[PDB]
Amino acid sequence: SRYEHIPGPPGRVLQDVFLDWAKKYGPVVRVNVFHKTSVIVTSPESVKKFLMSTKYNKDSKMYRALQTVFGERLFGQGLVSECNYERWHKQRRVIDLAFSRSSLVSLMETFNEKAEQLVEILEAKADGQTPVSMQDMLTYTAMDILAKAAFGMETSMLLGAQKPLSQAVKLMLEGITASRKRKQLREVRESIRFLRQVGRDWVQRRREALKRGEEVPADILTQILKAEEGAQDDEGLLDNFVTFFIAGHETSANHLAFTVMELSRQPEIVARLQAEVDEVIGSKRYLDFEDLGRLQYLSQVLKESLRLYPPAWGTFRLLEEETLIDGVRVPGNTPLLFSTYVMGRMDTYFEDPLTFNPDRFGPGAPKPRFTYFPFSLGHRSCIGQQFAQMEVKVVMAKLLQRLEFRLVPGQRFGLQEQATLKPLDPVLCTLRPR
């Protein structure tokens, strides 16, 4: 009854249903999500008001499935899932040092070496006939980049190593999904314990290295440790280990996979991207940091890919006091749902919204004003945004330099939702050298 007055109903995902309801019922609509009543707010005025203010905190009820799954602590109170402002702010300020401009410039060697490894593996299969899962190959690349860049760890998933780790990540993502019988419970719980035990093993290795006075370059793990200096126990440390182990590869992989999928049906845009990489980097194996800013059309293509295919569709804020939102009375203690997926597909905000058009992000084009937020906005925006944008530009630039991709017929463009949105199909392609 407390929500009955709010407007609403009486390879598809629930976000497509929400899109249909926002179009039909307007900027404030009641929905059921993760078995709670929520209100989806899709005006840009609401996005600005609620996301650009430290007055509005995340609604912790809507993060339970990242905190704990089936009674196993997962991300716990790490940086994504901590919804207390002061507890979040303390860790954010310490971990931010690992995402400074100087920190990220130092990661270009890791980005280049893993991108070069992927392209060499793909070139050996570029016979126009062997089907390759670009979803799988881009996930292995993203995991290898993250493990090296964040932790100084070589996972070598691109060599076929760490299969139990790859399986554990897959079942943990299925667990998040199922949360929000007997064998699936056992497999999910053991996978979460395995990921935390990877953290314990790697933190002990880092501590022993530091004790023996071995050289350890400052990385994300350095700052994760710094945030816990004088903690009562290692459970905060492991919460952020697992948070960054998962967060630092999965959305990047999703975004790469979506971009390759969509580009397979955009031959003219691919010819333009191939030309731009030819003009900017030439034959050079290695992209320098200053080359990234020169790949302007690729930047636009990746922004348009996130408009239609945001791996992280949005966020929630807790409305504490009854508030009028776009002419609608919204009760206190309500989860407000913000969706860049829904707003990206509304003709109100984007003309011909299903058309893939990188020129929407061109230099003279008007910037979306609070209608586009694939890294969210405000104080709780993605800490990894610049990390992600650099690594994906390096991977995509190296693929475009060296290879041609054709999507295998029968492969779909639809979505699935696990913890994030990702292609329904494996993005199975045949390849040829340029």
Ligand code: HEM
């Ligand atoms: C294309 C890639 C990526 C996308 C689309 C993405 C998207 C997002 C979004 C929408 C949020 C806000 C989530 C919320 O409000 O609940 C977020 C937060 C976060 N992301 Fe990402 N992300 C990406 C890459 C990364 C990477 C590479 C890392 C780490 C290296 C990372 C770590 C995080 C963390 C730790 C947070 C929580 C930040 C905070 O609240 O202070 N993300 N991301």
Ligand SMILES: O=C(NC1CC1)C1CCN(c2cnccc2-c2ccccc2)CC1
């Ligand atoms: O569960 C979430 N929000 C709850 C309201 C429902 C999102 C929180 C932000 N997440 C990320 C953000 N940056 C990078 C990666 C992830 C990521 C990917 C895989 C698994 C976990 C997290 C995406 C999920």
